[PDB]
Design a protein around this ligand. Structure first.
Ligand code: MG
Ligand code: ZN
Ligand code: ZN
Ligand code: ZN
Lengths: 168, 229, 61, 519, 58, 93, 171, 88, 84
RNA sequence: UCGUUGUUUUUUUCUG
């Protein structure tokens, strides 16, 4: 029922192993190709967003929709009740709670700082932004896609992410 | 671009007739009153006489008519046949105008010659067949309505209008409007499966029927027989 | 209605005094074919004379 | 509407891609293996699984639902079944093309007789059309008598002189002229041999020859697994009620199955290279006949009745064939045929419909506020009274037969429902006479119900129909929607056909008594 | 003409038919590109906005 | 509704009438197809609302069509004829 | 990790809904019917972007039915796991064959053979939980696990978490 | 069983002459045993749906093989009317 | 891309007979199955009569999409097409 | 108790 943006893709005689989704080997399927085309065909790059910025966007959009519904007049549950449908309500509340309980950045300013720090393949950079580690050793051990790239600069970025870590 | 059900056999006036007859019928003269427009039929007869701008305009009109006659008589219809299917009756439109406005009697017209010439020429540039500004589009548009425009000029000539028809201003304007509307109504419609129509129109007559002629000849033609009988 | 497929006559109307047999008896309107021509006609249940053990009986079976 | 709901999206076809069927795909789509030639299990119902009547293929009887799809007669489209052939066999239709392909390539190295070095073929490859490119390539390759072993830097060629092959009916003979003069050791090119040859062809030559990697792969032109159409394609005729005869396709498939089993049984015992040859040729023969039964220069397979068999090619071709028999033309519903009669007192576009036809034909009508009362009146009138209706269709498609609904008084229509009212006055109905030479041979009239049993026309409108009242018949096709009524009213109304585009002149006029009277 | 021959040739060449003809759409029971089927009808909302206020969809 | 009648109907250009007169007043039908192989091998169970093209192992890229039953039949011979006419609801060029 | 993508849907409006604000009616119907739907190609449809400026374009009239067919294109953000991706998890319940772990919308199963040996099931501990050396697992406690099996069931994907590798467990 | 009605049939499986008939009227009742109760299937001979008349003469005898052999001859009158055909 | 901007629309402005028939059929179908009526009605019950009455007033909310041979297309609103 | 199904295959003589 839900549509896509890529057409054709008829049967092919020569197959590929690059189908089953994998973050380590970068086989994201035909639906997340290197350089995609949008509805109107404007060249659009693949977009992946960390947990914190995804939470920011979801929260802002949900509250804007709530205001539009309410005509001129914030928490995950009250931001989850805007959705209609028992299953929709449950899923939106659960994902909002996940965003709250794992978003490494919460407020607008901290997210802005980390985003400016971060802003090559978009997946590794976005996953690095989402994935926080104490030292370069752990960042490489948990992320097998950047162990050997001949350009490290993990230590300083990790130290920055640590210094922006809010007290808990 | 004309649909097959919107044409009728009309006679193009300018093709036949001797040079003398054509001159006598279409050519206006202002210097020689013995060959000038009759005064009574026009309220401004005295004004026209001995003019020059009227003379140049009408010489241009006559030149256009002469060019049309030469063009048709040399290029299009060599044999001279002057009866050909074309859209929009003109005789019927003119006589409808006459009846509607009761253009009987010898009432002098109130229709200035420049009005007539300008209106005719403008009409020649409004019979749209293709609506586009490409140089090619304009050239093709001019090519398409060439014969019909020739006919229109052959009919709506100054002498003819002011003597044989004697239209007033309202009648002439209404005639122009009706001509425009009828022509724009007599075009083929996008999507018309003209192929099937041509197929049927050609096949059907054959059903009703020293050289060999008739069905065998048609069969030979269709198959492109290399060695006909 | 178990009273189908039994010869029935007509008492009032344009076909008064003609024999026939019920064909369809959906309700309140009986379609009885006429024996004389090759046609069928409708007629309400009130205008029918039903053949029975004795003579012809009105609609009181 | 009448179709049951489906979750799958509905769309309209846009492109039809042709090509042959890969054996692996054939296996993938088949749901069962057909091995037992006897169709019937034990002559006691429940036909035997693994045989031609496997219920998984699709149910053909009402009370049985397809074991595979689970639907009845309505939706079960028949489900293919495969069948493995012991021996590869030619595909009858592709013999000449296979011959040309074999000519164009080597017998051992299995490549083009020439490389791109030749400028003629260098240009030939550029031709975008596969067919013309293949024609040029064959013209340029059939000349080369020998597949060179060295580049005309070894080309990988076989060096063997490429045989000259001349087709012989169902069999292919290749002629070699071995090294000055030798004995010509021709032999029958076996289908399996050529298949193995083709399996080695690279995609480069494939595309150069006009073929395709995904869809038209040349070795697929040789039959290895024969798909088996469901019972729908070959339904069981009923000669007289209970006794059902086997469609010719059933006999042919069972015979091919028997022959295939028989070949599978020669290898396990004495097979003196002559039983093998004749038996495999017999199998090839049944396969070819089941694929086509009009091969030139060869006798024709027959039933025990002596009548020649009905091969699929025979089915498709001819006027009776599918294309000209049930695809372009087809017997339609909501029609009528009857005798005609002049009637001067009918307006030009009107037409007389006998009352019985009006009562029989029907035009669906949707229920609305503007017609609710009128339609309810029609419904009360019943189907046996005109005006009146025949059916009521619910929003979900449930039909009501007013004949068997004794309780019509207990029905209240709902907006959006559809009523099949009788053919009433002023309705627009098509009207045709066969043959229909030119578009004036069939126009749309306005109905005016009248008694007696003949269509009636205004004497003028005969001219286009080229019809006379001496026993001629014309057909009447009714629309079955609202748009269709719009088109009929606006494009095919008799008044709009007065002037014929053929000769830009009026087509109808005053004829016969009216003319001789006005004079 | 020669239907099976054409079908065989097309299958061999894997010919592609665009279904933009008349006979094709006729076979497939689709609105042919012709006559009333030579265009498409789009429902507009710019003009339907002009409907009075009590015409709003539920 | 012979061929010549089909041609006459084309002449007037009454498309929709011709379409319905050859589908609705005659052998209409519905089918399902796999959007990958473009075949008609989808295994559809409506009451189970489940679909699958086993060859493609596909269960989501499925379309249904309305075509004359005779057309389905012809395609069925053609597959039985070792020829695969694939139907796609999109143009590739 | 989430994806931001451009998504579109097909709508078929009955003509009884023909009025000025049909655009907003379709917008709200899309909002209602889009969320909570999961597919193997995209996954958990959770949120929608630009819920008030959806560009519906121009609707196409279906012949033979008269309904309005709408290609409603839009932009939405949704989530879906991939094998070889590492993200922390939250346990939700405990079972003998593996403690259920609810990683947001989805739930994570753990095999009995992909769990640390020193960690054992102890229902006696109140509330029930698993114990180890300087590691304690309970509902709402940050736990690291790796998911390498993604068998989507069309309606709700099935995920399995393993804590038997290095730098896995609870941070 | 056929959609028509069998009532005009006798107890012996035939219809007597002098009775009226019509379309969809079963004039002969024949039953074929079902190959293995309720083991009988119809083999009737309903009158053509578009014809009407009066049963005139029923002929009953044995065929070449001694099986019961029947024949029914319906008659009716055709009134000239509109649409008929005539020729000098 | 495929659409043509309103300023350079080149096709004939009039309404072809085929467009006329298609529009009438579509409108009548819509009205005849519980759709809004954009114009007043006095005594006419037939949907198709209502359709022509609506057209004569130029009050039809339908946009004709004309496909050029190449594939490009332009769109016209029924409100702006000169009907004979 | 709604429901409710009826052959093919050829050949023939005819109708416009
Ligand atoms: Mg005749
Ligand atoms: Zn089935
Ligand atoms: Zn070789
Ligand atoms: Zn598939």
């Amino acid at each position: 029922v839900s549509t896509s943006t890529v057409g054709a893709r008829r049967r092919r005689a020569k197959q590929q192993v690059d189908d089953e989704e994998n973050a380590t080997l970068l086989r994201l399927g035909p639906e997340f190709a290197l350089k995609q085309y949008d509805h109107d065909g404007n060249e659009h790059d693949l977009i992946a967003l960390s947990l914190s910025e995804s939470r920011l966007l979801i929260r802002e959009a949900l509250k804007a929709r709530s205001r539009a519904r309410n005509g001129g007049v914030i928490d995950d549950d009250e931001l989850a009740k805007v959705t209609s449908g028992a299953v929709a309500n449950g899923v939106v509340k659960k994902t909002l709670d996940y965003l709250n309980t794992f978003a490494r950045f919460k407020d607008e300013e901290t997210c802005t700082a980390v985003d400016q720090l971060l802003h090559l393949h978009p997946f590794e950079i976005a996953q690095l932004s989402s994935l926080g580690c104490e030292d370069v050793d752990e960042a490489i051990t948990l992320i097998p896609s950047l162990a050997a790239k001949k350009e490290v600069n993990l230590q300083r970025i990790l130290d920055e992410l640590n210094r922006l870590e809010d007290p808990y | 671009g004309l649909d097959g059900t919107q044409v009728e056999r009309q006679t193009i006036d300018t093709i036949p007739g001797s040079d003398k007859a054509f001159h006598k019928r279409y050519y206006v003269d202002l210097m020689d009153e013995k060959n000038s427009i009759k005064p009574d039929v026009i309220e401004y007869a005295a004004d026209i006489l001995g003019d020059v701008e009227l003379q140049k305009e009408l010489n241009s009109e006559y030149e256009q008519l002469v060019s049309d006659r030469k063009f048709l008589r040399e290029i299009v219809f060599v044999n001279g046949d002057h009866n050909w299917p074309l859209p929009v009756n003109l005789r019927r439109i003119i006589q409808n105008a006459q009846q509607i406005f009761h253009l009987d009697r010898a009432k002098a017209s109130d229709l200035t010659i420049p009005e007539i010439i300008h209106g005719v020429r403008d009409l020649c540039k409004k019979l749209f067949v293709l609506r586009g500004e490409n140089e090619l589009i304009k050239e093709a548009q001019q090519n398409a309505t060439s014969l019909f425009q020739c006919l229109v000029r052959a009919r709506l000539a100054t002498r003819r209008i002011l003597e044989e028809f004697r239209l007033n201003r309202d009648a002439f304007e209404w005639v122009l409007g009706t001509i425009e509307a009828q022509f724009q109504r007599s075009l083929v419609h996008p999507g018309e499966m003209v192929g099937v129509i041509a197929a049927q129109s050609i096949g059907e007559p054959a059903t009703q029927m020293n050289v060999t002629l008739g069905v065998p000849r048609l069969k030979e033609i269709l198959n492109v027989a290399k060695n006909i009988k | 209605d178990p009273t189908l497929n039994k010869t029935v006559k007509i008492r009032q109307g344009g076909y008064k005094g003609k024999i026939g047999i019920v064909k369809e008896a959906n309700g309140d309107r009986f379609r009885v074919e006429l024996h004389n021509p090759n046609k069928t006609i409708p007629i309400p249940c009130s205008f029918l004379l039903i053949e029975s053990t004795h003579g012809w009986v009105p609609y009181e079976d | 509407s009448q179709f049951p709901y489906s979750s799958a999206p509905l769309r309209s076809v846009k492109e039809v891609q042709f090509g042959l069927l890969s054996p692996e795909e054939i296996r993938a789509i088949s749901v069962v293996k057909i091995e037992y030639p006897e169709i019937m299990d034990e002559s006691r119902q429940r036909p035997r699984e693994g045989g031609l009547n496997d219920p998984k293929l699709g149910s053909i009887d009402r009370n049985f639902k397809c074991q595979t799809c689970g639907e009845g007669m309505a939706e079960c489209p028949g489900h293919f079944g495969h069948m493995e052939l012991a021996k590869p066999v030619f595909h009858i239709g592709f013999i000449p093309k296979i011959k040309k392909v074999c000519e164009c390539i080597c017998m051992n190295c299995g490549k083009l007789l020439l490389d791109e070095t030749n400028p003629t073929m260098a240009q030939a490859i550029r031709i975008r059309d596969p067919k013309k490119r293949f024609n040029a390539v064959w013209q340029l390759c059939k000349t080369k008598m020998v597949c060179e072993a060295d580049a005309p830097v070894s080309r990988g060629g076989c060096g063997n002189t490429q045989p000259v092959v001349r087709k012989d009916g169902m069999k292919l003979w290749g002629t070699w002229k071995k090294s000055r003069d030798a004995q010509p050791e021709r032999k029958l090119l076996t289908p399996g041999e050529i298949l193995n040859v083709f399996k080695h062809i690279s995609p480069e030559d494939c595309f150069r020859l006009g073929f395709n990697e995904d869809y038209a792969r040349p070795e697929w032109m040789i039959i290895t697994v024969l798909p088996v159409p469901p019972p729908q394609v070959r339904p069981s005729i009923a000669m007289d009620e209970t006794t059902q005869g086997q469609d010719d396709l059933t006999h042919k498939l069972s015979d091919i199955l028997k022959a295939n089993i028989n070949v599978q049984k020669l290898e396990m015992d004495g097979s003196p290279q002559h039983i093998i040859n004749e038996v495999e040729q017999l199998l090839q023969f049944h396969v070819a006949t089941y694929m086509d039964n009009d091969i030139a220069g060869q006798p024709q397979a027959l039933q025990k009745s002596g009548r020649p068999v009905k091969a699929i090619r025979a089915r498709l071709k001819g006027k009776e064939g599918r294309l000209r028999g049930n695809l372009m033309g087809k017997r339609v519903d909501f029609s009528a045929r009857t005798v005609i009669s002049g009637d001067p007192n009918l307006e030009l576009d009107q037409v007389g419909v006998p009352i019985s036809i009006a009562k029989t034909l029907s035009y669906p009508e949707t229920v609305t506020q503007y017609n609710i009362h009128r339609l309810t009146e029609y419904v009360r009138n019943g189907p046996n009274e005109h005006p009146g209706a025949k059916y009521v269709i619910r929003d979900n498609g449930d039909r009501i037969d007013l004949r068997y609904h004794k309780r019509a008084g207990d029905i209240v229509l709902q907006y959006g429902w559809k009523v099949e009212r009788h053919l009433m006055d002023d309705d627009p109905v098509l009207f045709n006479r066969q043959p229909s030479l030119h578009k004036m041979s069939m126009m749309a009239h306005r109905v005016k119900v009248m008694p007696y049993s003949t269509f009636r026309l205004n004497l003028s409108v005969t001219s286009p129909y080229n019809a006379d009242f001496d026993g001629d018949e014309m057909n009447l096709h009714v629309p079955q929607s609202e748009e269709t009524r719009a088109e009929l009213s606006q494009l095919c109304a008799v008044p709009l056909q007065i002037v014929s585009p053929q000769s830009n002149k009026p087509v109808m006029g005053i004829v016969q008594d009216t003319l001789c009277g006005v004079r | 003409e020669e239907t099976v021959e054409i079908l065989f040739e097309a299958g061999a060449a894997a010919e592609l038919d665009d279904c933009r003809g008349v006979s094709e759409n006729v076979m497939l029971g689709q609105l042919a590109p012709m006559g009333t089927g030579a265009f498409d009808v789009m429902i507009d909302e710019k003009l339907l906005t002009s409907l009075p206020a009590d015409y709003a969809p539920t | 509704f012979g061929e010549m009648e089909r041609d006459c109907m084309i002449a007037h250009g009454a498309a929709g009438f011709l379409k319905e007169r050859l589908m609705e007043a005659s052998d209409a039908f519905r089918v399902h197809v796999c959007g990958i192989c473009g075949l008609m091998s989808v295994i559809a169970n409506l009451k189970k609302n489940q679909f699958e093209c086993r060859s493609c192992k596909n269960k989501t890229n499925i379309y249904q069509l309305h075509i004359p039953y005779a057309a389905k039949l012809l395609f069925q011979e053609l597959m039985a004829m070792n020829i695969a006419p694939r139907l796609y609801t999109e143009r590739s060029g | 990790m989430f994806f931001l993508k451009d998504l579109s849907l097909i709508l078929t409006l009955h003509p009884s809904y023909f009025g000025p604000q049909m655009n907003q009616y379709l917008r709200e119907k899309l909002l209602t019917d889009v969320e909570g739907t999961c597919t193997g190609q995209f996954g958990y449809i959770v949120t929608v972007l630009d819920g008030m400026n959806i560009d519906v374009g121009k609707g196409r009239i279906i012949p033979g039915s008269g309904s309005a067919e709408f290609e409603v294109k839009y932009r939405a953000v949704v989530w879906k796991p991939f094998k070889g991706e590492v993200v922390d998890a939250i346990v939700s319940n405990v079972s003998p064959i593996g403690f259920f772990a609810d990683v947001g919308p989805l739930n994570v199963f753990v095999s009995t053979r992909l769990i640390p040996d020193n960690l054992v099931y102890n229902p006696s501990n109140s509330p029930p939980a698993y114990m180890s050396n300087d590691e304690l697992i309970t509902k709402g406690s940050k736990v690291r696990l790796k998911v390498v099996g993604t068998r989507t069931d069309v309606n709700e994907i099935y995920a399995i978490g393993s804590i038997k590798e290095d730098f896995l467990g609870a941070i | 069983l056929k959609h028509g009605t069998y009532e005009k049939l006798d107890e012996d499986g035939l219809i007597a002459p002098g009775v009226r008939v019509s379309g969809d009227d079963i004039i002969i009742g024949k039953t074929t045993p079902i190959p293995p109760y309720h083991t009988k299937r119809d083999a009737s001979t309903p009158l053509r749906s578009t014809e009407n008349g009066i049963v005139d003469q029923v002929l009953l005898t044995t065929n070449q093989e001694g099986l019961k052999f029947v024949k029914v001859r319906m008659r009716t009158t055709k009134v000239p009317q509109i649409g008929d055909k005539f020729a000098s | 891309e495929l659409a043509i901007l309103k300023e350079e629309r080149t096709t004939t402005p009039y309404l072809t007979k085929y467009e006329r028939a298609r529009i009438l059929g579509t409108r009548a179908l819509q009205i005849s199955m519980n759709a809004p009526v954009l114009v007043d009605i006095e005594g006419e019950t037939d949907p198709l009569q209502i359709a022509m009455k609506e057209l004569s007033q130029r009050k039809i909310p339908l946009v004709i999409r004309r496909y050029l041979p190449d594939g490009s297309y332009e769109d016209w609103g029924c409100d702006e097409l000169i009907v004979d």
